[PDB]
Amino acid sequence: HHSGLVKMSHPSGDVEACMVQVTCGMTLNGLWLDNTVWCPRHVMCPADQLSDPNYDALLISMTNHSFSVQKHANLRVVGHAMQGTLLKLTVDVANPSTPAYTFTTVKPGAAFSVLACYNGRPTGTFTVVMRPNYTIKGSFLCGSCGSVGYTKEGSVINFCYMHQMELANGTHTGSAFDGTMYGAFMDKQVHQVQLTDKYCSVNVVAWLYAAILNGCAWFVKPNRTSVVSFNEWALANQFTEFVGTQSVDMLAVKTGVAIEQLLYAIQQLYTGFQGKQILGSTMLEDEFTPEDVNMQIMGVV
Amino acid sequence: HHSGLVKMSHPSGDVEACMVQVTCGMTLNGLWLDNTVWCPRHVMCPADQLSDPNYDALLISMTNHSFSVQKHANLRVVGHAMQGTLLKLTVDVANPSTPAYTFTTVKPGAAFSVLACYNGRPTGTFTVVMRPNYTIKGSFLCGSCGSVGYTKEGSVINFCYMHQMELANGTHTGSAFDGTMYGAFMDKQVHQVQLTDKYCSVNVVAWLYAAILNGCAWFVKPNRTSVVSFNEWALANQFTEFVGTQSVDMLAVKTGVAIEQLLYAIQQLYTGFQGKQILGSTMLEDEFTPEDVNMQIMGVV
Ligand SMILES: [Mg+2]
Ligand SMILES: [Mg+2]
């Protein structure tokens, strides 16, 4: 029995029309909104300087004309500025396809859609959850920097991620559009400390609710664990602390199963499934959010 | 260690611009290409007739004006015809955003991208593999029929799927654009026989190659199973028969591990992983194709 859950991204058309190529001296991608093009600042870096760039000096060394911005058109750069790990290039033409948009920061456990681009050309789209250590388990190769991640509310696109780098363990991280890197990461090509990943408890709860909604409830018992007790346990067992939301409450109402019943189940399941399966898995799944389950299974948006 | 594999869909913009709403008497989605709108023929069915429709009589009962086609514009229908399980509506305006396209049929184990739409509005995109029983493990609700699936080669979109129905086990099926349903399914709301699903052997091989490409090769031994011997075994063990491709051969060259080594490994792993993991899983994975692995990990397209 199939759960009806898939990794679901937003339609990407609105964002495709915002992607450009930026070249200064490698070539990466930029995001063109109104009269601004955003791109990673390491576009300025010579290849032999990627491990210890002096970005302040590099910025000083460029003129507006140093930055070549092309859409697959040529956009003339008339201003340049650095904000954190991003460049803000002012161009002479306002993107006529600029969507309604905001900038936001995504929180661990929350999902967003990524448009992977190479040489300014959209090539694929996928969805990821921001991990508790501020990496994403993405799919990015050389030339993908400047690819963007976003959520969407109504017609408004909320840009939350600009791709910067791959870590030694194969995961990925990037910047918010305030120019801060997610986590403690730096946009320099050196090995860096990585925080531990953790299971996202709220998303595990969501997935167990998805199981119940599909007739799979063998793991539900009358036993309950309080949120306070679970969160103490979580800190010793590589789980995030659980913070309930209205979305989780809607699943509890629809199924008649209390959150505290599933927090108890998680504690037991973490010790082992004992050969049993849940929605075809023998391990906890934390890559689907409460919102995913509400929307995809219940049609509640 | 993250494999760098995600469920990757094509960018959806080209197809978003082709989606319309079709209403005749429920409302579902259509695909507008040139002067033609394609949609499921059960748009003609009254709700009390979905279990045993007489589609030939329904078609006879409609005029061009019976079909209301709207883009979120109104497209005037000037001709109507039925081909298999699809309607072909001729409209008076050619879609100015028609991409270069073909129609194709997808084969079991092959991946395609789906644009899920409701009321003519694109709402999400995801990727699925066609299962050996001609279902897909999708995410579709009431109102999604007429949503389309496609592959893409260069700039050309190859449309391969138009959504029709959900089966009792939660999976999905639909039509090719020749109007044939995939598999033995009929577009009638009655319980129907479902063929067994099977593991897609070529995709399991691809995933084991992805593991090797990520430094995970504990399951590789000198032992080999021939393709002929494996395929005899597959028929008794709910696997597809294996048919190698150039894409698989590229993975064998890059890793230095022969296909026959991985066919032996599959036979052993199918008896159990013995507590060991491969790319974070304790079961065989068949949802990634050889092409996925070549493109996402090796950048070979
Ligand atoms: Mg379902
Ligand atoms: Mg990798």
Side-chain angles (χ1 to χ4, degrees), chain A residues 2 9 13 16 125 138-139 296, chain B residues 2 9 13 16 125 138-139 169 296:
Chain A
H2 170 56
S9 297
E16 289 168 51
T125 192
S139 180
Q296 286 192 43
Chain B
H2 170 56
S9 297
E16 289 168 51
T125 192
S139 180
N169 74 344
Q296 286 192 43

Side-chain angles (χ1 to χ4, degrees), chain B residues 1-47 50-51 53-70 72-87 89-120 122-152 154-187 189-197 199-220 222-231 233-237 239-245 247-253 255-275 277-300:
Chain B
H1 196 269
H2 170 56
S3 69
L5 287 176
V6 300
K7 294 298 181 70
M8 185 83 75
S9 297
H10 294 289
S12 60
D14 286 350
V15 176
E16 289 168 51
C18 298
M19 302 302 310
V20 297
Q21 183 186 87
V22 185
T23 317
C24 180
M26 17 61 239
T27 288
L28 40 67
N29 310 279
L31 182 74
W32 177 25
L33 305 169
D34 296 324
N35 285 91
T36 300
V37 175
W38 301 82
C39 73
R41 64 176 177 171
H42 71 259
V43 72
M44 298 184 297
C45 198
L50 291 174
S51 289
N54 192 310
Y55 287 116
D56 290 336
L58 291 168
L59 186 75
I60 296 165
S61 79
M62 303 297 173
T63 81
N64 288 331
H65 307 274
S66 303
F67 295 99
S68 183
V69 183
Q70 314 169 53
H72 315 286
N74 306 261
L75 301 181
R76 173 171 174 248
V77 173
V78 301
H80 62 285
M82 181 163 61
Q83 186 174 351
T85 62
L86 300 183
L87 300 173
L89 309 177
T90 305
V91 291
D92 63 344
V93 176
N95 184 354
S97 294
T98 304
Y101 75 93
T102 74
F103 296 136
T104 196
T105 54
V106 274
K107 288 166 188 301
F112 61 104
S113 290
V114 175
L115 185 61
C117 298
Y118 293 83
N119 300 296
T123 66
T125 192
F126 62 92
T127 179
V128 289
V129 151
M130 176 61 71
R131 301 307 310 173
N133 66 359
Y134 291 105
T135 69
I136 55 169
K137 300 180 173 183
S139 180
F140 297 101
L141 300 174
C142 285
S144 61
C145 287
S147 293
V148 297
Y150 47 96
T151 67
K152 186 180 219 156
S155 274
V156 183
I157 296 164
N158 315 308
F159 293 104
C160 62
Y161 181 91
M162 182 162 273
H163 186 53
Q164 295 270 8
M165 63 197 307
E166 186 177 281
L167 298 318
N169 74 344
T171 67
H172 302 101
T173 194
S175 316
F177 281 86
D178 66 7
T180 63
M181 300 286 289
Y182 280 97
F185 294 108
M186 321 175 194
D187 61 332
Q189 189 168 299
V190 300
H191 288 276
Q192 293 177 50
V193 180
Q194 199 166 127
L195 274 45
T196 192
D197 203 347
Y199 282 101
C200 299
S201 302
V202 65
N203 291 351
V204 179
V205 167
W207 172 74
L208 292 178
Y209 277 122
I212 295 160
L213 289 169
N214 277 288
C216 176
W218 65 262
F219 52 84
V220 178
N223 311 53
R224 293 168 46 112
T225 295
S226 71
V227 172
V228 286
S229 314
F230 176 87
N231 287 349
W233 174 90
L235 294 171
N237 288 277
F239 281 74
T240 58
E241 294 187 87
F242 176 91
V243 182
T245 71
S247 191
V248 182
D249 297 336
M250 279 190 264
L251 300 172
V253 167
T255 62
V257 175
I259 289 166
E260 291 80 6
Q261 292 180 266
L262 298 184
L263 295 184
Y264 180 89
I266 291 170
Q267 296 178 302
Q268 308 309 141
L269 292 167
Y270 179 70
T271 74
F273 282 36
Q274 300 176 341
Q277 290 185 3
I278 297 174
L279 294 178
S281 180
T282 50
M283 39 197 76
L284 297 176
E285 167 71 84
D286 75 351
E287 295 189 341
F288 296 103
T289 69
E291 292 85 2
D292 285 322
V293 175
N294 273 290
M295 291 188 291
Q296 286 192 43
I297 296 174
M298 293 172 17
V300 174

